[PDB]
Write a protein that binds this DNA or RNA. Structure first.
Ligand SMILES: [Mg+2]
Ligand SMILES: [Mg+2]
Ligand SMILES: [Mg+2]
Ligand SMILES: [Mg+2]
Ligand SMILES: [Mg+2]
Ligand SMILES: [Mg+2]
Ligand SMILES: [Mg+2]
Ligand SMILES: [Mg+2]
Ligand SMILES: [Mg+2]
Ligand SMILES: [Mg+2]
Ligand SMILES: [Mg+2]
Ligand SMILES: [Mg+2]
Ligand SMILES: [Mg+2]
Ligand SMILES: [Mg+2]
Ligand SMILES: [Mg+2]
Ligand SMILES: [Mg+2]
Ligand SMILES: [Mg+2]
Ligand SMILES: [Mg+2]
Ligand SMILES: [Mg+2]
Ligand SMILES: [Mg+2]
Ligand SMILES: [Mg+2]
Ligand SMILES: [Mg+2]
Ligand SMILES: [Mg+2]
Ligand SMILES: [Mg+2]
Ligand SMILES: [Mg+2]
Ligand SMILES: [Mg+2]
Ligand SMILES: [Mg+2]
Ligand SMILES: [Mg+2]
Ligand SMILES: [Mg+2]
Ligand SMILES: [Mg+2]
Ligand SMILES: [Mg+2]
Ligand SMILES: [Mg+2]
Ligand SMILES: [Mg+2]
Ligand SMILES: [Mg+2]
Ligand SMILES: [Mg+2]
Ligand SMILES: [Mg+2]
Ligand SMILES: [Mg+2]
Ligand SMILES: [Mg+2]
Ligand SMILES: [Mg+2]
Ligand SMILES: [Mg+2]
Ligand SMILES: [Mg+2]
Ligand SMILES: [Mg+2]
Ligand SMILES: [Mg+2]
Ligand SMILES: [Mg+2]
Ligand SMILES: [Mg+2]
Ligand SMILES: [Mg+2]
Ligand SMILES: [Mg+2]
Ligand SMILES: [Mg+2]
Ligand SMILES: [Mg+2]
Ligand SMILES: [Mg+2]
Ligand SMILES: [Mg+2]
Ligand SMILES: [Mg+2]
Ligand SMILES: [Mg+2]
Ligand SMILES: [Mg+2]
Ligand SMILES: [Mg+2]
Ligand SMILES: [Mg+2]
Ligand SMILES: [Mg+2]
Ligand SMILES: [Mg+2]
Ligand SMILES: [Mg+2]
Ligand SMILES: [Mg+2]
Length: 111
RNA sequence: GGGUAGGUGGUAAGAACCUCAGAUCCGGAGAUUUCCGAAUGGAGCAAUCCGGUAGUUGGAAACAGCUAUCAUUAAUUGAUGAAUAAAUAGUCAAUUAAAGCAAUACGUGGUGAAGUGAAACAUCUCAGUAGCCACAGGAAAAGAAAACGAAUGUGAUUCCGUGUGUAGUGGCGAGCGAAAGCGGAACAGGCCAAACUUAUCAUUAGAUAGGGGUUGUAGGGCUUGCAAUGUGGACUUGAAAACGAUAGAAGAAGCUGUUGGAAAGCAGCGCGCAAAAGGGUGAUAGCCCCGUAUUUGAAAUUGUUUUCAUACCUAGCGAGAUCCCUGAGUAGCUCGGAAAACGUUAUUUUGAGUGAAUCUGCCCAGACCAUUGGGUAAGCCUAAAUACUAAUUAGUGACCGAUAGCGAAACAGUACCGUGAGGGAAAGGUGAAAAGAACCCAGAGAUGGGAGUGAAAUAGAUUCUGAAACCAUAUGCCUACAACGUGUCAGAGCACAUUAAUGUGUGAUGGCGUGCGUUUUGAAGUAUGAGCCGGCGAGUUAUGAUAGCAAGCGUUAGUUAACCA
RNA sequence: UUGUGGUAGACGAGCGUUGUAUUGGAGUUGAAGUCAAAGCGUGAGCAUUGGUGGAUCCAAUACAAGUGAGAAUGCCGGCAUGAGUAACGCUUGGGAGUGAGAAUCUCCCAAACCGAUUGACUAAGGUUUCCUGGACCAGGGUCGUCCUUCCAGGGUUAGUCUGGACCUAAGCUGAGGCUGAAAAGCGUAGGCGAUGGACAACAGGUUAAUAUUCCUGUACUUACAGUUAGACUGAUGGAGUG
RNA sequence: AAAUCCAGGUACGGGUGAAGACACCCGUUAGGCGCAACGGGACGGAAAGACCCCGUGAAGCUUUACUGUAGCUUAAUAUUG
């Protein structure tokens, strides 16, 4: 399975942004990146191009979007625990459904 | 089958979809596989053209779709059948194999030079090398003594060390150079012909298909008995098991503060280890991530080994007879060549000619004869150790790091050159992240100057660092009566202030002064080589000999080579 | 105390580069590289500071070398000198327009050369160079708003034309076969091979680009089937013509 | 653009010198820098002299040079009575 999936809450443990909590919107496995909403906001200088029916307007000024972040800098966020903390996960297989599930190693919380 | 939550190959954003009834992706097994090309229906200027035959569907037929088949050679079988009665030649049909390619590499065989050396050259060497051709194989070749060879000897072949640069062979010149023996790697021996016998061929068999046999301290057959039912194979089918190969699963351990754009660096306090190999993460991370040590797992295909059964092959010691068999245009010999270290010679081989004997036999022990001894030619097959790497997996390097390393880090045998064979380049790096510069000004625009992002824009796509030659700008000094290898020793004036040093920059003027390498008796040279700058560019390696120095071991010393771990 | 010029040459002692092995050390508070300066050594050489640069490097003792560049009419790359010099490879003037910019682009009027040709149709070859619009990185021996250059789109219509589905010449290939160490050479029957032979379409119009091809008009030729009438049909071979 | 180019700030007379000097010795002359000319010199440039000699160099050709050989011719022997 994968350490980080599309949807789970995640934070950053290195860089200028420390303790930045967000939801992963998209994962590129090949480039080992991850788009997390609200984090790594870059503002491309949006030019103007008019060669299509939609390009006739293409209103784009200082649109701030999301820049991808290396998957190593991401860490899963705990929610079930009363005191939330950042830890590592296991890949135990519970015989109830025989499906692999991530479980933290500093607690006993699933996913 | 594995495996998930993403995917629709790269320059690549966007549009539109697919995907949790399990996608994309990885592995095993299959399906489809246009045309040229051995190309093989016929042709042809390769990727084109023109068909025949037998089916089937439309048409009223020509015709048009959709299928299968149609080359040549060799072998077997059957049919037909000339000159010419029979019979062959030939013709036709059916079945089975062959064609070709590549691994710039190893094997075998045929053919086979020259440059060069001998300080010339012809014998010789180079060299049975290059090249040309044929046939393979996963290796090939060789192979079980008519042997070595001098002994109370060894007992297929192959490969390594030594014997040794020895015996020898050489216009006895340049050179060439074994075979024994010894030490090792591996080890395996089998099977036909003839006798004798069985059955069948107008049985003129002298032919076909079986039993019997495979030799040297001779063997086998003929007749007559004892003992045997085993051990082992280079061996067929199956069944079972084990070890693997082709995807994978799990896989421990960290926070705080400081400089910093960013920590993983630094410091403090800790933790894990059968994991401190490696890669990435904004700098230099055992504990951030992927992994690694370790434990594991295969539906399907495939490799090795073992066990059981099952085919095939595989078996000893006597007696008598005194009879038969033991590989012929063969061994020898003569005339021309060659192979072996030998430049032809005892041994091996052959183009021409001739030509034997049959265990009281034949060959050999460097001409040859006799004695002694060794071995059984003229038939075949043979694993292992040995040679090599185009390719697949893992990994290593006192190997290279864009003039280096493969010619080719990029889309390189490309661009390009030549009718053709053939020849054959250069060219890598923005930033952590494109956040690739919206917007304003000048301009026609590219572009430039600001703004903005960024730690850095003198990192801006001309994109890591940016040297010299070369071209321009400027502070300071000098220079327009001056004979100059352009410098050196003195020396005013001018302008500054340093790796603080009897300082630095320029140099009115005085004295002296014909470059650097090469090759020459002798070069400023009217001898030669260099336009300048930068990179590259020429005493090495392997095997031996001598001598100097030093160390280890020493007076029945010293030291191993191959090979094994 | 005696000495210390020196080529060929002999001997001895050292420096420097890259990497490896052992020790220690420095580095985003800035390493290598790289530039400058008024330093230290007997020599190869070695430091200090500052600028640029952005991640490795240094000292000691040993070891191994693709280990030292000024010359080879040396190789490669760059840049000078000659020198803004020679040369720019046969053809004039003006008006109007476009354009930011015009001797060079567009149109018009002349002018000058070709006129058995610089005119028109095609074979061979070339392979999109053809037409339209746009552009002025590069190429055009100047310029350029323009080009045979570049970008985007488009363009080649056959029963009768040129060649196959027809035929052969020189010649090539060639089952069998002959010859030859091998590869192969020769060659019969067959099969290819035009630059030749046989074969049915002419006139006009149309698009920016095609036209005996598309359109209009009028024709012709060869096959197959049905049908009507007549006739016995007569080749893979012989002969004539070709 | 081009060949060329050791660096140049590149006079003349007599002498000297590797024997014919822009550069040496002794004298004379000459303000700095161009442009258009013409070729005296720079033993000017282009071509590692083709003439000559040397090399125990190469190649082509010749012959009663040497050694061989294709081919031609003669004999023995086998096919061969
Ligand atoms: Mg599946
Ligand atoms: Mg010779
Ligand atoms: Mg010689
Ligand atoms: Mg010689
Ligand atoms: Mg064999
Ligand atoms: Mg895993
Ligand atoms: Mg882990
Ligand atoms: Mg690390
Ligand atoms: Mg003999
Ligand atoms: Mg020999
Ligand atoms: Mg005997
Ligand atoms: Mg003897
Ligand atoms: Mg015998
Ligand atoms: Mg290269
Ligand atoms: Mg380069
Ligand atoms: Mg070409
Ligand atoms: Mg800028
Ligand atoms: Mg540049
Ligand atoms: Mg740069
Ligand atoms: Mg003056
Ligand atoms: Mg005067
Ligand atoms: Mg004077
Ligand atoms: Mg003077
Ligand atoms: Mg002076
Ligand atoms: Mg002087
Ligand atoms: Mg020198
Ligand atoms: Mg001389
Ligand atoms: Mg002389
Ligand atoms: Mg001179
Ligand atoms: Mg001369
Ligand atoms: Mg010379
Ligand atoms: Mg010169
Ligand atoms: Mg140089
Ligand atoms: Mg010694
Ligand atoms: Mg001396
Ligand atoms: Mg070192
Ligand atoms: Mg520095
Ligand atoms: Mg070198
Ligand atoms: Mg030049
Ligand atoms: Mg110039
Ligand atoms: Mg001039
Ligand atoms: Mg002139
Ligand atoms: Mg002129
Ligand atoms: Mg002209
Ligand atoms: Mg003119
Ligand atoms: Mg006229
Ligand atoms: Mg014309
Ligand atoms: Mg073109
Ligand atoms: Mg046009
Ligand atoms: Mg145009
Ligand atoms: Mg121009
Ligand atoms: Mg028509
Ligand atoms: Mg034809
Ligand atoms: Mg014709
Ligand atoms: Mg036309
Ligand atoms: Mg004199
Ligand atoms: Mg000469
Ligand atoms: Mg000679
Ligand atoms: Mg010679
Ligand atoms: Mg004769």
């Amino acid at each position: 399975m994968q350490r980080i999936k599309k949807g789970d809450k995640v934070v950053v443990i290195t860089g200028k942004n420390k303790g930045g909590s967000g939801i992963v919107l998209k994962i590129m496995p090949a480039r080992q990146q991850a788009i997390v909403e609200g984090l790594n906001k870059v503002t491309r200088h949006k030019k103007k191009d008019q060669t299509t029916k939609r390009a006739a307007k293409q209103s784009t000024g200082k649109v701030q979007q999301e820049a991808p972040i290396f998957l190593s800098k991401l860490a899963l966020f705990d929610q079930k625990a009363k005191q939330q903390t950042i830890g590592k996960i296991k890949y135990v297989m519970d015989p109830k459904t025989n499906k692999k599930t991530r479980v933290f190693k500093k607690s006993n919380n699933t996913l």
